[PDB]
Design a binder for these strands. Structure first.
Lengths: 194, 195, 195, 194
DNA sequence: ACAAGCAGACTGCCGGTAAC
DNA sequence: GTTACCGGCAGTCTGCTTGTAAA
């Protein structure tokens, strides 16, 4: 089909920019390198996508959805029994998933700069952020956590989690960093609950 | 008259202009021509004073970060805190005020980790806001107000929380309500962290 | 207009202009801005048709070298030679005519070995003047007018002697006398090389 | 004293530029690199020498006189007996000396383009060129070579020798190339001497 | 004799538009 | 789909000019 082929070149470009941008940063890979690696011409790319930024937008979407997939896998398998335990299992899950350098480059470093903080927020509300808003909402609902404004709490905890990830990855002894950071995140969480 | 002065003066104009412009529009979105022009200098003199665009951004980060600490310490002194715990609460409220500056949000919260790399900017913040967070925790532990725990991780995590808090307040649809509510969840967080 | 024609048209204008200017002043002494401006195109369109300055110089060389061969063959045909020896003599007299063109001396005798490398330019000349020399020698052997010997070495050596002959005539203070005398020693050299 | 100190940095600049330009070409080394290798600053370089060209001129001078030195050694050691045999030995001597890659880069390639063909000529008249003019003059003088204009002949034979050198250096089988080129030069010379 | 500040210029490259 | 093309940029060079010495 003619439009069925469009999706195939968009997948080749999205896969390639994800690999390359994930390896080195959005600024440090240009559209030529990316087109070459995808097996398409710069012209076709600028036909399927508005600009470099828009291709970064669809890369972000794909990556974030994978993060949610792998995370839910870990959270379901943890086997929590109360919303609070679900929150802790989510924390440990992100700690496992944020170990991926692709995720840190695309989501934690480049995305707020490419799409703008509000822009990436509009994207993350349909993913990790909004799932945090829901975990908080459920923990409030089941009486494990004081009623309070949810949007702020979720954003802040997301901040703590993101920076947790960078700290563990760049620390000189990563095993001890993951242990101690997990400890303090737990202590922080329990101090939040009842 | 002297060259020590001539260098320093050109660096002062270049850092001033790059701070203004980069802060208004982002590091990616302003080129060295525009920066030179606004500074009243030639691109050549700039590439003599600074290695590349990145090196100039590093000195802009430096000035901005110390400016952040100056303003914060000013606000904390006037509050009249008396114990590490009070210092922590007054610090949070202070950052909420200072981070109202969009130049601070653009340069420090967004670009710096991208331009310098995350560990690079960290090496910078340990000598400023990060290091102060480490001292506030460390003294709060000493004074028995906060349980002994690994200090560097806690400090980094709390910094992450405060940063995304400031971005949240700035970009909210009604910033007054967002500042009030965000202060709320930060306070509850602290109080649950302390005794 | 077609795309192959739009490319061919700008490539011809860049080659024409780079030929004019580089021939007037040397490859080192003319930049791609001047060259584009003279072609009436943007530096960007140029870096689309040509890899870099060097690649454009390579195509300029190619054009100039075939113009050299064309002018040479015209003059030699007009001599009315009939044997390989007569062809060799008429060739020398032709090179003396053609190398009067300073554009030829500038681009081929001076810049080309430095830009493309001695081996690189040789790879180019082997398909033009050098190859014509190798064939003129080869036929001179075939007809028994010249002693059997390694052909590539003789061809390269005679080329060196001819080139420096051209520079010599061009830069001498009385050029008319220089062409007469230089022609003399080349003729004697040739006759001593033949029988 | 200041003149003893001044002269020494020009020796270090000239040695450093000789090594470097000789390795990579005049176009491919900048004055910064050259200052660094000499152990001096660009300001000192531009105080002792007018421009990049001026340092190249003094490098040319040194190299050319070194060529004449080594050549004189081999020509003395061969032991010719008449001007003609002096010429033949001179050629084989150059063939040996031109084996040096520094000499081929600075004298045979860059110098005419940097200094201009006439400029380098004015330099070579006090060395290999002018000596060639003298060997021709003496060969005419002893009746071994026909009376003819000397300047043109000397320039031409210099051309044949120079290009001979590059051919031997760049050839795929350099041993066979030295044999064959020596051969064709011998035949040329003998056909010249009568 | 040396050093530093500085200015004009240049090369190769990129991102996005528009003509094929 | 594709190829030509434009405005603009970052980092480097070269030589000039103003400052700071070791004689």
């Amino acid at each position: 089909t003619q439009e069925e082929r469009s999706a195939a070149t968009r997948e080749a470009l999205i896969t390639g920019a994800r690999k390359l941008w994930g390896l080195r940063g959005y600024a440090e890979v240009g559209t030529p390198e990316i087109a070459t690696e995808a097996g398409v011409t710069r012209g076709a790319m600028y036909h399927q996508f508005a600009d470099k930024a828009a291709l970064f937008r669809d890369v972000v979407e794909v990556v974030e959805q994978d993060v949610m997939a792998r995370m839910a896998t870990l959270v379901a398998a943890s086997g929590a029994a109360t919303p609070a335990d679900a929150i802790r299992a989510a924390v440990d899950a992100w700690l496992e998933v944020s170990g991926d350098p692709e995720v840190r480059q695309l989501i934690l470093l480049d995305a707020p700069v490419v799409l703008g903080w509000a822009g990436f927020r509009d994207v993350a509300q349909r993913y990790s952020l909004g799932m945090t808003e829901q975990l908080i909402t459920e923990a409030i609902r089941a009486g494990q956590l004081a009623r309070q404004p949810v949007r702020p709490l979720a954003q802040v905890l997301i901040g703590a989690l993101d920076e947790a990830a960078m700290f563990i990855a760049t620390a000189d002894d990563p095993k001890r960093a993951r242990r101690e950071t997990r400890q303090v995140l737990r202590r922080l969480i329990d101090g939040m609950l009842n």
